[PDB]
Design brief:
part of a larger assembly, 7 chains, A mainly alpha (98), B mainly alpha (102), C mainly alpha (70), D alpha+beta (48), F mainly alpha (48), C: 70 residues, mainly alpha, 2 helices, 0% strand, D: 48 residues, alpha+beta, two-stranded antiparallel ribbon, 3 helices, RNA-binding, Pre-mRNA-processing protein 45 (chain F), Pre-mRNA-splicing factor CEF1 (chain A), Pre-mRNA-splicing factor 8 (chain D)
Chain lengths: 98, 102, 70, 48, 675, 48, 91
RNA sequence: ACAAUGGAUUCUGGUAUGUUCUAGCGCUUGUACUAAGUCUCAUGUACUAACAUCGAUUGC
């Protein structure tokens, strides 16, 4: 029964070291973010406002995706004059962020 | 028998939404231009904001209805078969895929 | 995972937009700089008196594995 | 100048053009500071 | 079709190539017939590259021309799949097209062996009873032979630790292990499979069979018992070799004496001639048919054991993926495979000699002959086959003809297939190691008489048993035009001149046997000895195996592997190196590779850092203890004219060079020669 | 339609796929018959 | 020392072959204590393979077995491919 | 009557690799008691060498 439990545990584990190590690392990263967010919320209850730190650049031309719309491709110009649609979408977007 | 090609599938999807637009006008009837700016070159079409809203609502309703008709299919097919040995859900979906081959 | 087939090859579209370096390779040094233009003892015994398109079924393959195994 | 531009300040270039490390290096520093033939063949010409 | 469906179909490409290498038929149920056609087109395309790269790299390893250490293991792993794929295909051609022996052949083959044993009055070997007086001594000789494998090696795997335990259980209970073997011979007929592996030898690839340990004990007992009871009942006659009474260098020595001892061979005053034939029997063991084999063994063996031997050969042969049932050929890795192989060769020995001559060579049953002895000289003069001997699968026939008996023999060959352009001297193969004066002179009378000798001998054995071919044939005719009789025995390349056929009688060195007549006690011929070219490359491949296996091996293990292979060279071929110039260049190049291995362990190949004191001082003084054979002046004499005649030693090339001169001794001065 | 690929050698995701998806038709010719019958007829002639 | 096959070791061997295929037995035998990779390879090919038929012989198959055992005496791995039975069943 | 003399050395070698290490503010809201460092030797443990280990004779 002990070797059957060991075989039952071995047959039902299909991942590997790198996959398992990656899962552990991902869980750790998620816990680290939740802890930092809680730390910021508790300091916000005390009035002190501290901003979220950015992940540091690993290389020189590393990209902050939040700062800039990235390799923006504009919709091809069309004959249908989408002018009021852009006004309504801007108003709804600013309303959302409000 | 057999499958349906994409040009025959698209017409039947187009024939189906015409019946949804027919009964939408029948359920409404039961209850009760082109301007081309020469400088820009743009063409502006003036249309009813109700029919544009009813277009945006019906696409969201069809998107949710197919979302819910697939979610129940996920919950049913997971709790149908448990005879053949599996390990995870991706093994079950693959061993079921072998069954439709034969 | 991590050991994958290619779904597509690396294109030269990406290397064309890069800035060059101008590093000096030994095989890009000048060479062949001029082109050429065309103008009774037998009785006592017991028993007295072509090409196939298959590399494995080939005759040379049978002579190979008979000498190189022994 | 070339050694110091590459950040290799833990390698001392003697006045007799002998190149020796000033400390026990990490393996990352041994990978970085492994100069090639054209440095050393130039350095041995100056030793000569 | 999207990136998903293109991703799954490429796994049938990978699966097909694993089925090709396994020699498993790749058939997917429900596969579309155009798409299956595409994959088989590209698996055959990849196979054409895979097989041709195995042929190209094999020819590089034989030349020694810079093959990577990984690629030698890779080329070994490719050929063993190609050998079994050729083996499995050969098995299916017998299963489809029936046995290669016809019922007319197998009836006559069976009738020859019944006729022979009835004249010998051979009593067949019985099943070993419970009350057998030699049963405990035969069992110990079996188990000691199985135990000698493991006294050498240190660490053992799970199969080898099982094998020593099963011997220790048989030492402690000798009566209980006999009852287990006696039960396995009566009952057991389905056996565990055999794992095959192939040993790399850099010129060829030899097969090795691994039998299960519990089944290996009852094979080793049976091989002791079959070989003890055959020699007591005198089954195998005098010509069958290895003899159990003489070393392979003594087999060369007696056969060379026993030619010269027999009368009137060298007398060429008339047109009389002497012919010596050498043919390998091709795929002798590979063509053994089990139904003929089980019927033949019932003549000499109690049918309970004769059924054991036949069923033991019918087992599964496993490489890594590859697996097939050995329907047809004999497994040489079994313990009693040697008894089968020589008894099957005795059947071939009776097809060539016939009933009448094989009784004359073996002598009568009650008082048989020695190896080359006749009961009288009149028995010898009849029937021109003079001396016959057979090694493993290599036969050696001496024919002494008259001129009239020679002309009849060579006319009926030219009646069947003549040549108008006189082209029999083109494909005639002789010894390219001897000079052109010393090898066989290609005279039209003697060449056609040599091919007529082979034509008579090839017709006596059917092609269903052995493949006797002219390319594997070596025939040396002695006549008035050929003073030399040339043959190749157990790695020894021998040349013979009679005493009267020499121009002048010059004194000779250790490489020359002096051949004495029995009754005159006079030296009447000289036997000129050389190592075969096939053995020179065999030793050159052993030096490679010392270096290629040693990754980061210590210095004195390389010196000890050099010594155990240099001793095994010189103590076997004792006096035969001296006449061989290619082997002396191998000894110099081989020993300096061992010295360079010690120079590659350090980071210097500089000669001054490594005197002869470093390598050749004994291990008690701290050196490697290398035995030298290459601080020797190598004879260099006029290669343009050395192919023509034997020039003699006119000049000496230097062998190994060193700054401070040391005369390092060589073991050829310390090993007394065979003569 | 292409069947899915189940291999005996490789299982990257580690799926448990049933034993029939993981893993001759002729007879002997008359040559093996006539060989064995002639060997018995030669044997029965040899015994008599 | 050579153990016998219990029903727990058989169902681990079935589940491992169903996991690993049949061309890696040192990985199958690592789940089973007391079994070598050669022992688990042979147990599958002789007893646990579902392709193998452990059925009674018909009246034709009995006469067809007696016919083969005179044609091929006595070659039980070769007869078992003709019979499409395991060889110890044929003997 | 023989004068014949090849070599040669560097580089690529189990902790590798990976992460975090805001001091110096960007305007508005919100008098709770005494163990130093270096060098050498010995012992204990852990890691590591992808180090090595069977060559030969007996008094019932």
């Amino acid at each position: 029964k002990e070797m059957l439990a060991e075989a039952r545990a071995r047959l039902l584990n299909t991942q590997g070291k790198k996959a398992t190590r990656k899962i552990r690392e991902r869980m750790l990263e998620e816990s680290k973010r939740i802890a930092e967010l809680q730390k910021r919320r508790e300091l916000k209850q005390a009035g002190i406002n501290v901003a979220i730190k950015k992940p540091k650049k690993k290389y020189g031309t590393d990209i902050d995706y939040n700062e800039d719309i990235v390799y923006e491709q504009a919709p091809m110009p069309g004959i249908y004059d989408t002018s009021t649609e852009d006004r309504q979408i801007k108003k709804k977007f600013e309303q959302f962020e409000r | 028998r057999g499958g349906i090609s994409y040009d025959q599938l698209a017409k039947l999807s187009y024939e189906k939404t015409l019946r949804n637009l027919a009964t939408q006008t029948q359920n409404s009837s039961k209850q009760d231009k082109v301007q081309k700016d020469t400088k820009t070159g743009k063409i502006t079409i003036a249309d009813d904001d109700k029919l544009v809203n009813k277009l945006a609502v019906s696409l969201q309703s069809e998107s949710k209805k197919r979302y819910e008709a697939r979610k129940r299919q996920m919950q049913n097919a997971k709790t149908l078969y448990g005879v053949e040995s599996f390990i995870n859900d991706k093994n079950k979906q693959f061993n079921e895929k072998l069954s439709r081959e034969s | 995972t991590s050991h994958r087939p290619q779904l597509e090859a690396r294109s030269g579209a990406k290397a064309a937009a890069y800035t060059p370096t101008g590093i000096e390779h030994a095989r890009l040094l000048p060479g062949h700089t001029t082109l050429k233009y065309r103008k009774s003892w037998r009785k006592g015994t017991a028993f007295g008196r072509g090409y196939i398109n298959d590399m494995t079924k080939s005759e040379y393959h049978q002579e190979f594995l008979h000498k190189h195994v022994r | 100048l070339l050694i110091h531009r590459k950040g290799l300040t833990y390698l001392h270039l003697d006045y007799n053009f002998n190149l020796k490390p000033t400390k026990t290096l990490t393996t990352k520093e041994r990978k970085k500071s492994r100069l090639g033939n054209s440095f050393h063949l130039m350095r041995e010409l100056l030793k000569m | 079709i999207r990136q998903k469906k293109a991703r799954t179909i490429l796994q049938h490409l990978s699966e097909a190539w694993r089925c090709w290498k396994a020699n498993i038929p790749w058939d997917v149920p429900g596969m579309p017939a155009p798409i299956k056609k595409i994959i088989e087109r590209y698996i055959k395309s990849k196979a054409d590259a895979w097989v041709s790269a195995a042929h190209y790299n094999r020819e590089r390893i034989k030349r020694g021309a810079h093959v990577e250490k990984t690629m030698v293991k890779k080329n070994l792993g490719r050929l063993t799949r190609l050998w079994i794929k050729n083996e499995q295909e050969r098995q299916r051609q017998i299963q489809k097209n029936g046995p290669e022996i016809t019922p007319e052949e197998a009836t006559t083959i069976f009738s020859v062996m019944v006729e022979w044993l009835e004249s010998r009055s051979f009593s067949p070997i019985p099943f070993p009873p419970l009350t057998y007086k030699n049963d405990t001594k035969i069992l110990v000789l079996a188990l000691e032979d199985l135990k000698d494998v493991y006294a050498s090696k240190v660490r053992l795997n799970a199969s080898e630790r099982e094998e020593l335990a099963l011997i220790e259980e048989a030492y402690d209970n000798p009566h209980d292990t006999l009852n287990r073997i006696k039960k396995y011979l009566l009952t057991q007929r389905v056996f565990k499979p055999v794992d095959i592996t192939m040993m790399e030898n850099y010129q060829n690839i030899s097969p090795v069979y691994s039998v299960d340990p519990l089944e290996k004990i009852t094979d080793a007992y049976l091989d002791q018992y079959l070989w003890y009871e055959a020699d007591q009942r005198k089954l195998f006659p005098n010509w069958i070799k290895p003899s159990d009474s003489e070393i392979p260098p003594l087999l060369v020595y007696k056969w060379t004496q026993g030619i010269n001892n027999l009368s009137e061979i060298w007398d060429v005053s008339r047109g009389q001639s002497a012919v010596l034939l050498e043919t390998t029997l091709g795929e002798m063991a590979e063509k053994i048919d089990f139904t003929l084999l089980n019927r033949l063994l019932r003549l000499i063996v109690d049918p309970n054991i004769a059924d054991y031997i036949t069923a033991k050969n019918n087992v599964v042969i496993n490489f890594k993926d590859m697996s097939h049932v050995n329907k047809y050929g004999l497994i040489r890795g079994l313990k009693f495979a040697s008894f089968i192989f020589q008894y099957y060769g005795l059947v071939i020995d009776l097809l060539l000699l016939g009933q009448e001559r094989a009784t004359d060579l073996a002598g009568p049953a009650n008082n048989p002959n020695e190896f080359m002895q006749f009961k009288s000289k009149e028995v010898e003069k009849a029937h021109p086959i003079r001396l016959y001997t057979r090694y493993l699968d290599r036969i050696y026939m001496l024919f002494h003809f008259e001129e009239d008996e020679g002309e009849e023999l060579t006319d009926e060959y030219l009646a069947e297939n003549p040549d108008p352009n006189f082209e029999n001297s083109i494909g005639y193969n002789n010894r390219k190691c001897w000079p052109k004066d010393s090898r066989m002179r290609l005279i039209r009378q003697d060449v056609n008489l040599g091919r007529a000798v082979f034509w008579e001998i090839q017709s006596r054995v059917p092609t269903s048993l052995t493949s006797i071919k002219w390319e594997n044939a070596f025939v040396s005719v002695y006549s008035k035009n050929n003073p030399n009789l040339l043959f190749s025995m157990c790695g020894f390349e021998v040349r013979i001149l009679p005493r009267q056929r020499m121009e002048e009688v010059v004194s000779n060195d250790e490489g020359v046997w002096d051949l004495v007549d029995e009754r005159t006690k006079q030296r009447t011929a000289k036997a000129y000895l050389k190592v075969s070219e096939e053995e020179i490359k065999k030793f050159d491949s052993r030096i490679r195996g010392i270096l290629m296996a040693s990754g980061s091996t210590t210095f004195t293990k390389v010196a000890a592997k050099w010594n155990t292979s240099l001793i095994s060279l010189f103590t076997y071929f004792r006096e035969a190196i001296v006449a061989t110039e290619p082997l002396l260049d191998i000894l110099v190049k081989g020993e300096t590779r061992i010295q360079n291995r010690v120079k590659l362990g350090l980071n210097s190949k500089m000669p001054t850092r490594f005197p002869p004191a470093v390598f050749y001082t004994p291990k008690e003084l701290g050196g490697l203890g290398m035995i030298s054979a290459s601080h020797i002046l190598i004879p260099a004499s006029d290669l343009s004219w050395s192919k023509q005649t034997d020039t003699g030693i006119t000049h000496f090339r230097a062998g190994m060079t060193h700054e401070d001169e040391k005369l390092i001794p060589t073991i050829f001065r310390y090993i007394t020669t065979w003569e | 339609k292409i069947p899915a690929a189940v291999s005996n050698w490789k299982n990257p995701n580690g799926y448990t796929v049933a034993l029939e998806r993981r893993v001759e038709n002729n007879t002997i010719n008359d040559g093996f018959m006539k060989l064995s019958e002639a060997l018995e007829n030669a044997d029965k002639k040899a015994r008599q | 020392k050579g153990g016998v096959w219990t029903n727990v070791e058989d169902q681990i061997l079935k589940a491992a072959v169903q996991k690993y295929g049949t061309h890696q037995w040192s990985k199958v035998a690592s789940l089973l204590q007391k079994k070598t990779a050669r022992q688990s390879e042979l147990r599958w090919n002789e007893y646990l393979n579902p392709k193998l038929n452990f059925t009674e012989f018909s009246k034709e198959e009995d006469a067809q077995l007696l016919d083969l055992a005179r044609e091929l005496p006595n070659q039980w791995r070769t007869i078992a491919d003709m019979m499409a039975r395991p060889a110890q069943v044929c003997v």
